[PDB]
Every structure is written in C-alpha cells, then in structure tokens.
Amino acid sequence: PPQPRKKRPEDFKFGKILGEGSFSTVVLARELATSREYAIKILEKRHIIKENKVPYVTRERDVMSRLDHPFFVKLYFTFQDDEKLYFGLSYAKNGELLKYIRKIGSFDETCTRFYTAEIVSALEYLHGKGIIHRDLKPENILLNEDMHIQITDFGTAKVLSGTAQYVSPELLTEKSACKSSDLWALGCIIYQLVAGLPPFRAGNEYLIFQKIIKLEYDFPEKFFPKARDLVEKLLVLDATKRLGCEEMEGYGPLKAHPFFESVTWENLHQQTPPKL
Numbered sequence: 350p351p352q353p354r355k356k357r358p359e360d361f362k363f364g365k366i367l368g369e370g371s372f373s374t375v376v377l378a379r380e381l382a383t384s385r386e387y388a389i390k391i392l393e394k395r396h397i398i399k400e401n402k403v404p405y406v407t408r409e410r411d412v413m414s415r416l417d418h419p420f421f422v423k424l425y426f427t428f429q430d431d432e433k434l435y436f437g438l439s440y441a442k443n444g445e446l447l448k449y450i451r452k453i454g455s456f457d458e459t460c461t462r463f464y465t466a467e468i469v470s471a472l473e474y475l476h477g478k479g480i481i482h483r484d485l486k487p488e489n490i491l492l493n494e495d496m497h498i499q500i501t502d503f504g505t506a507k508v509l510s511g512t513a514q515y516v517s518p519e520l521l522t523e524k525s526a527c528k529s530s531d532l533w534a535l536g537c538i539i540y541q542l543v544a545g546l547p548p549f550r551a552g553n554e555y556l557i558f559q560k561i562i563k564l565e566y567d568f569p570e571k572f573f574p575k576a577r578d579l580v581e582k583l584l585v586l587d588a589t590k591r592l593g594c595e596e597m598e599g600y601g602p603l604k605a606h607p608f609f610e611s612v613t614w615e616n617l618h619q620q621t622p623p624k625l
C-alpha cells in the first residue's frame with residue numbers, strides 16, 4: 350500500500366521551541382498543505398555520530414513507530430536533509446505534566462486518581478509490548494489539548510526479548526532494569542502529584558541516590574491514605590515485590606487497588622478529565 354511521498358523542511362512553517370536536550374530540539378511546525386501542527390524533533394547527524402548516540406535515536410524511531418495507543422506520542426513520519434534528521438511527532442498542546450504540578454501545587458484526590466489511572470493504563474500497554482521506558486517522569490508525560498496524557502521520549506527505552514529523582518534502586522545496586530523500574534518511577538510520580546514534590550530530594554545527585562538505596566523518604570501528614578498505601582506498594586527495594594510486576598501477577602492486582610475503586614479502566618481517554 351503506497352505511502353505519501355517523503356516530506357521535507359519546506360513543507361512546514363517552523364515556530365517555537367517545545368523542548369531541548371543537548372543532542373536534539375523539538376520545534377513546533379505547521380504543515381502547509383494541511384495546516385496540521387506537529388512537534389518535529391530535529392537532530393544534527395554529525396553531533397549524534399560524534400557523541401555515539403545513534404543507538405538511542407534508532408531505538409526511539411523503532412519504538413515510537415510500533416506504539417499505537419492514545420496515551421503515547423506518535424511518530425507520524427521521518428525525513429532528513431544534508432545535515433539533519435526530522436521526526437514528526439504528535440503535538441501535545443498543553444505541554445508537560447511537570448508544568449501543571451508547579452502551577453497548582455499538588456493535585457486533589459480526584460485528579461491524582463484520574464491521571465494515575467491513565468499512566469497505569471499506558472504502562473500496561475507498553476509493558477504488554479515487552480517495552481520498558483526507563484526514564485519515566487513528569488517532564489515526558491505530556492498533556493494533549495483535551496488534557497489526556499501523552500507519554501514521550503523513548504530513546505532510552507529497552508525492548509525485551511535515568512533521571513536522578515526517579516531512578517530505581519536496582520539501577521544503583523546492579524545496573525539492570527526491568528518493568529518494575531517503570532513501576533518505581535510511577536510510585537515517585539504519584540507521590541509527586543499528591544505532595545507536590547518528588548519523594549527523594551537532597552542537595553545533589555549523590556545524596557539523592559544514597560536516599561533511594563536506603564528507601565529514605567516519608568509522607569506529609571496531608572496525604573490521601575489509600576494513595577499512601579499504593580505508593581508504599583510501589584516504592585519497595587525488592588523489584589520483584591512491586592505491585593504490578595509479573596511476579597506479583599501483573600496489572601490486575603494493581604488496577605484492583607482500593608485507591609482506584611471508582612475508576613473505569615476500559616475507556617479512560619474518552620472520559621472527560623477532572624478540571625485542574
């Protein structure tokens with residue numbers, strides 16, 4: 350089945366910068382023929398070769414192409430010119446989940462519940478494909494125009510067959526990740542929605558890591574009891590004992606947790622999100 354001919358830079362009107370890393374930049378672009386907006390990731394080939402990042406770039410192109418689900422940023426197309434690679438990605442108009450955390454301070458139980466539920470539902474899909482994110486965080490959990498999540502940033506994903514504050518203990522005591530690594534990250538993110546801050550904080554990276562391996566953190570007095578219980582079943586040193594992992598029999602027990610009592614799991618992206 351014939352695909353549309355290769356696109357090129359001149360097919361777009363480029364606008365503002367949407368995101369920045371030291372090897373790539375995401376720019377908003379409007380396709381002239383359609384007036385559609387895309388988030389185009391631009392990568393300079395020479396810099397990526399120089400910095401030995403080719404495996405990461407390929408990894409992301411491969412992963413983001415196979416993902417077909419509303420809670421994931423989609424890769425629509427790729428092209429390149431003499432110097433640059435272009436990835437046409439979903440444009441998540443409302444930006445980072447991190448922004449909303451900073452904006453409103455900390456979520457109420459209704460919003461925490463709904464967004465956690467979406468995240469859990471996205472991970473179930475992802476893990477179902479034998480893919481592990483490895484760098485899940487509020488920065489790359491984006492929000493669509495409709496205020497549903499869209500997860501992105503897959504260069505560091507692992508196909509089976511990170512950021513200091515969200516790093517799992519196994520990554521510090523063995524250097525080997527699994528699906529439970531994502532579930533640990535999830536426990537950190539839930540904590541952050543409720544409290545307004547990540548669980549493991551310190552003056553520098555070394556001190557942060559030191560806290561992780563000791564499981565040194567605690568709950569504010571004001572912290573939804575059932576959310577606290579859930580977090581405590583995710584933030585567990587033993588990776589095989591995190592709710593949701595294969596050795597704990599997967600996503601059934603996770604979705605059945607009392608914190609999610611009122612959630613309808615089947616059609617989350619069709620539900621109207623709670624107002625922030």
Ligand SMILES: C[C@@H]1C[C@@H](NC(=O)OC(C)(C)C)CN(c2cc(-c3ccc4c(N)[nH]nc4c3)nc(N)n2)C1
Pocket residue numbers: 367368369370371372373374375388390392402405406409422438439440441442444491501502503504
């Ligand atoms: C830009 C930084 C660094 C980057 N790191 C990288 O490319 O690392 C390599 C090793 C070179 C592969 C990962 N970044 C991203 C960022 C976005 C993104 C950002 C905003 C968006 C919006 N508003 N709509 N859509 C969006 C997609 N999407 C992906 N996929 N990645 C974040």
